[PDB]
Amino acid sequence: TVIFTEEQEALVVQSWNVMKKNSAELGLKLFLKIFEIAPTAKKMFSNQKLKGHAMSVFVMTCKSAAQLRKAGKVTFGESSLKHMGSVHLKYGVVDEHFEVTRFALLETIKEAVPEMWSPEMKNAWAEAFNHLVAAIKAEMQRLST
Ligand code: HEM
């Protein structure tokens, strides 16, 4: 497991509560940053699907932070992990795409809540994001065999 503190969860929960006021705009900013860095990713999404996908990234990472605090591990149901993993595989999503998305997510948060930004805030989001991404792949691995 990992030790993910009440303070770390509160950073994620509290910044998301502030950013939620502008969730549609923030979702667009996230994808604008992703597509600025790696425009080739735009082809995967050839917009209401972009809106839903950005919201999934934010809300699913938030829920991963809550599960890390509560359980030391990500506890998403297997059908949800299996869906994300199969869809990502189908579309050719590889590690670099997750890495660019993480980078863009953290930049987006930093600009959305400059008054809360700090190394601790960055690391709390990043840890929750990384554990969700790893959890999808561990579920896809349980099914590769
Ligand atoms: C932790 C990070 C991510 C989470 C939580 C996440 C979540 C999701 C979910 C819930 C879906 C299903 C949408 C549906 O069934 O309609 C989905 C689909 C998809 N994801 Fe992700 N995703 C992540 C990362 C990525 C990344 C890094 C890429 C590529 C840069 C990507 C590209 C796609 C595409 C192309 C689809 C299918 C089209 C769409 O639903 O818009 N995803 N993702």
Residue numbers in the entry: 6 to 51, 63 to 161
Sentences from the paper on this structure:
Phytoglobins (Pgbs) are plant-originating heme proteins of the globin superfamily with varying degrees of hexacoordination. Pgbs have a conserved cysteine residue, the role of which is poorly understood. Class 1 Pgbs are distinguished by a weak hexacoordination (KH ≈ 2) compared to Class 2 Pgbs (KH ≈ 100). Due to the very high O2 avidity of Class 1 Pgbs, these proteins generate a tight and slow binding of O2 well suited for O2-dependent nitric oxide (NO) scavenging in low O2-containing environments.
After purification, the two phytoglobins, WT and Cys86Ala, were successfully crystallized. The monomers in the dimers showed antiparallel orientation, with the heme groups at the opposite ends of the dimers. Therefore, it is plausible that these two residues, Tyr 115 and Cys 86, are both involved in maintaining the redox stability of the iron. Undoubtedly, the conserved cysteine present has a protective role against autoxidation and may be involved in direct electron transfer from the heme iron, affecting the oxidation state.
